Point group: C2
Chain length 570, copies 2
């Protein structure tokens, strides 16, 4: 019963918008009633006592219903697509704004690309469902459900005939659909083999021509083509049947209905109008059955993505209860970690009960080998994930009782692989401040030594950098990220391998600038280059989940053995 | 008149296969005649003197035509797609085998990827054209062209009415199509802007969340959505009209025809059957006009690719006249170049009248800086492009009078970026010999020191390497190419920067193996690594299109000044 559940949950979204949905559904009901009423009036016009009598009276009604059908076919078709577009945009906006504001750990668990693809494809399929369903298939469903009583009360024998014809047509349609799907699934493998071979051999034309392999490649292609012919032969009959079934069924239904009508009229139990009515009934029944069968197929195909979308929306629906928690204000800087421990891959906890203190105006440099616990410590400093054990204290206030909107503002962190939007370089720089202006941007660029690089080259400081910074090299991206970070000028600052892809000449000036800008601020520095560490005030050693050394630059000469090994190494 | 020309040139390909095309066209003509004849017989059945008289006689004929229509709808639909598939495969095979055997210079001029895409897309569009045209639109064209005389002779007033209705419907269809295309072209830009923004901001979720930019991004998305709503508002009416026009026209035509029929019958100048016939005539005319208009739109869209395909096929149609030219046999090796000169980019000829001699059993190493004339010389050795000036002599026979199938076999050349198929590594190695066997493959791999690397790792020597060798590193690809070249063991051999991506340890053994295997053969070696040149017998210096030095390793110590500079440099 998954199909009906997804139909209901897709109709709930339309039920969010009540007025337009009510207008569309009542319009569809009226269109269905007119669609049923038209053939009866056509039969009334045609019968008209042979054709001798009053023709004007039924003809006027028939023309009026025809004009109403024209106007409704315009109005319903316009309203349905307007509603579908508006609802798809609203749903996409709501899902996006609920998805973007939710922790990263879920993004790494699922995959941001996967979430984006799910959202886009599911919204497109849902829009198609909304657009087609309301108008055409609400009309068809109501039309058939109301047509059953009319045939039941008019010409019971032909009512049973129509029901039998519809059932047989639907069953044959399902059979053809299944046996065509099987054949297509069988053929696709040979098709893909053929075209992959063609592409691979054409791309490497030089190798083929250099070894006199033209004859062999042509023979292989002919063999693959013969394989396709053999694989396609069994399914040609079903392909032809799928192509022709609609006209087959229309002609067969018309023939059966007309033959029975003539047989009954010859016996005097029926009249011409009741036959002209049932011919139209059969024709419209066949057409609408075909349409709704195609719709059901499309929905069955799209169910796989729709269930995933609904699962993601249900999962990404609730966060912590909103409240005006006591956010830290006038942050000065004193960071203590006590007994903190976390399990990153749900097993094999990295950090083992680390504890340390960071004083005002002091810079801390963390160094280690293959141990990944320093990155986990940095993440805990930003409070990416709440620690299962241990505590973090800043300014005498618990980090767990501080609003994220203030904690994010209080710390500026630049890491190894900075990301840039596909906007202009000025726009990318501008995100440091909420408002900012055009004045201090140049000063920040000069401080990061990016103003000179971006002024003349790359067509001024307004060019559109490629996606994920694909139009610039790693050094330029790192310089831009440094400029953004120093423009943010948060009192708490973090470097994480953001200066590991540049030569010494610019590295020295970048380090000098970031140190001068951080004289009054506290910074956490992590890097594999043992050149910016010599200017630090407190060096910490992070090895295999443990902290073993805590001291200044002048006290680490004789402190630690492995640390001494690293110091003598470089 | 381009459209009719492409239609004619697309029908020529079907005209290649005569019997099946004749059967399909005569079947389509019969189907069209039956389609026209059916409404007249329906009117005959309905009229039947009110409905009092002989009903069996017309009803039997009508049922017979219905059954024939069913059988024809199956048979024609099957035959059309069988023919279309066979013809598309044949055309693709012919075009591929004519394209793959033609010089590279055209491939670089156009682009092998572009040629492949043109061929595939054009063949797909041509197959769709063949499949739809024959059955459905040959039936429609013949049906309308024959329907005009029938209406002309039956009920001239209604013939004129039908012609007017058809003309008006086609004109309104064209208007709606144009005004929908304009709106879609206007909307696409805002649509793409919206979705590009969504993708860019979701991908960089960490940056957005780290700077409290969620509100700004949501506001920007809402602004883009409002822009889409504003851009889509003007075209909703035309979208609704395009959706509804078919039912609009069907209902309007039926209403007009029935009203005129009742008006004429009231005056006694017409009968019921002639009205029931014209209602069906109008219905089928509307349906077939819609179908053929959609077909014309599709063909107009596909013309852009079809003209390019025809241009490429005409260009890639003729080569030099086939002949049993005197191919060189029992090649021993003595290569002389005299006064050869070529213009690569049609301007600024690289090589300037070079002349040199290469003796049996002697290896020649060509060295140079930024000069690209050495690569042109190598290409001329393989006779990639015929020299405009100068001559090349081998074995006392002109290279211009030697078959390519022998010249390619006589020389084995491995260059900087070797290409490998997406087959197994064994299959890639096997192309050295036409037949070969599984025995000497292992010996060749051992000689190239690739057997040990490929035996245990990468799941034996049968794994499917990725496209263009994407599953292996540059060193492994170079080793595989060396193995293939030494398996070919041609008496003339060429290295072109095929050992410039490996460390010294394997480089020394690779050079030793290739030198030992080339003791009895003549080789041309080009590389930027000045380590394999010390074992050469004749070193040539190629600078800015000129040859200035010609001597052995022992005579180049005091020969040349710039060459001496390169020698002392490395
Ligand atoms: C007056 C003429 C009436 C004709 C009615 C014919 C009924 C025969 C169907 C059984 C054949 C079968 O086997 O199934 C047919 C398949 C079922 O596919 P499925 O179940 O959804 O597959 C996913 C499994 N989960 O598609 C159909 O349902 C096509 C029939 C839809 C038209 C019926 C109109 C009313 C539907 C909505 C009512 C609230
Ligand atoms: C008994 C009822 C008969 C109705 C006939 C209606 C004719 C009106 C068309 C003019 C309108 C217009 O303006 O053009 C209509 C556009 C022309 O597009 P195009 O020229 O190809 O654009 C590319 C420029 N290069 O598409 C059509 O042609 C649609 C009409 C095709 C149906 C006609 C059947 C016979 C066609 C083949 C005959 C050998």
């Amino acid at each position: 019963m998954s199909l009906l559940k997804i139909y209901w949950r897709a109709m709930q979204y339309l039920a969010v918008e009540r007025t337009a949905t009510i207008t569309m559904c009542v319009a569809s009901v009226l269109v269905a009633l007119v669609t049923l009423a038209e053939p009866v009036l056509f039969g009334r016009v045609i019968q008209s006592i042979s054709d001798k009598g009053d023709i004007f009276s039924p003809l006027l009604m028939w023309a009026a219903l025809g004009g109403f059908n024209i106007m409704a076919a315009v109005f319903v078709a316009r309203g349905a697509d307007r509603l579908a577009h508006r609802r798809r945009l609203g749903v996409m906006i709501d899902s996006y704004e609920r998805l973007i504001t939710m922790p990263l750990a879920w993004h790494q668990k699922r995959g941001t690309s996967n979430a984006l693809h799910t959202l886009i494809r599911a919204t497109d399929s849902l829009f198609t469902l909304w657009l087609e369903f309301m108008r055409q298939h609400l009309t068809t469903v109501v039309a058939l459900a109301t047509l059953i009583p009319v045939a039941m009360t008019m010409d019971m024998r032909m009512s049973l005939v129509l029901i039998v014809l519809g059932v047989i047509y639907v069953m044959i349609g399902q059979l053809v659909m299944r046996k065509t799907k099987d054949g297509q699934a069988a053929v696709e493998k040979h098709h893909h083999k053929l075209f992959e071979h063609v592409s691979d051999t054409i791309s490497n034309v030089s190798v083929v021509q250099s070894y006199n392999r033209i004859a062999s490649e042509t023979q292989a292609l002919r063999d693959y083509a013969k394989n396709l012919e053999n694989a396609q032969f069994p399914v040609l009959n079903w392909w032809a049947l799928a192509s022709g079934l609609n006209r087959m069924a229309s002609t067969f239904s018309m023939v059966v209905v007309l033959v029975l009508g003539a047989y009954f009229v010859t016996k005097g139990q029926m009249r011409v109008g009741d036959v002209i009515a049932f011919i139209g009934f059969a024709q419209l029944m066949i057409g609408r059955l075909d349409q709704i069968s195609a719709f059901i197929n499309q929905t069955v195909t799209a169910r796989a993505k729709l269930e995933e979308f609904f699962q993601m929306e249900d999962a990404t629906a609730d966060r912590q209860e909103p409240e005006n928690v006591a956010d830290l204000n006038d942050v000065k800087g004193d960071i203590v970690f006590d007994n903190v421990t976390y399990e990153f891959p749900n097993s094999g906890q990295g950090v083992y009960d680390v504890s340390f203190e960071v004083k005002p105006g002091q810079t801390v440099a963390i160094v280690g080998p293959t141990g990944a616990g320093k990155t986990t410590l940095i993440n805990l400093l930003q409070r990416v994930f709440d620690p299962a054990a241990g505590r973090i204290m800043i300014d005498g206030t618990d980090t767990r009782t501080v609003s994220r909107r203030s904690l994010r503002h209080a710390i500026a962190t630049v890491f190894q692989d900075a990301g840039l939007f596909n906007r202009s370089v000025e726009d990318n720089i501008r995100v440091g401040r909420a408002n900012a202006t055009h004045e201090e941007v140049h000063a920040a660029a000069k401080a990061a030594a990016a103003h000179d690089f971006i002024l003349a080259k790359s067509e001024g400081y307004d060019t559109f950098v490629g996606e994920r910074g694909s139009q610039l090299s790693g050094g330029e991206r790192q310089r831009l990220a440094i400029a953004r970070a120093i423009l943010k000028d948060s009192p708490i600052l973090v470097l994480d391998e953001a200066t590991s892809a540049l030569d010494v000449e610019t590295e020295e000036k970048v380090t000098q600038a970031v140190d001068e800008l951080s004289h009054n601020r506290t910074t956490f520095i992590i890097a594999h280059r043992l050149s910016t560490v010599r200017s630090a005030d407190l060096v910490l050693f992070m090895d295999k989940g443990h902290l073993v050394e805590s001291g200044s630059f002048n006290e680490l000469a004789e402190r630690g053995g492995r640390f001494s090994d690293l110091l003598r190494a470089g």
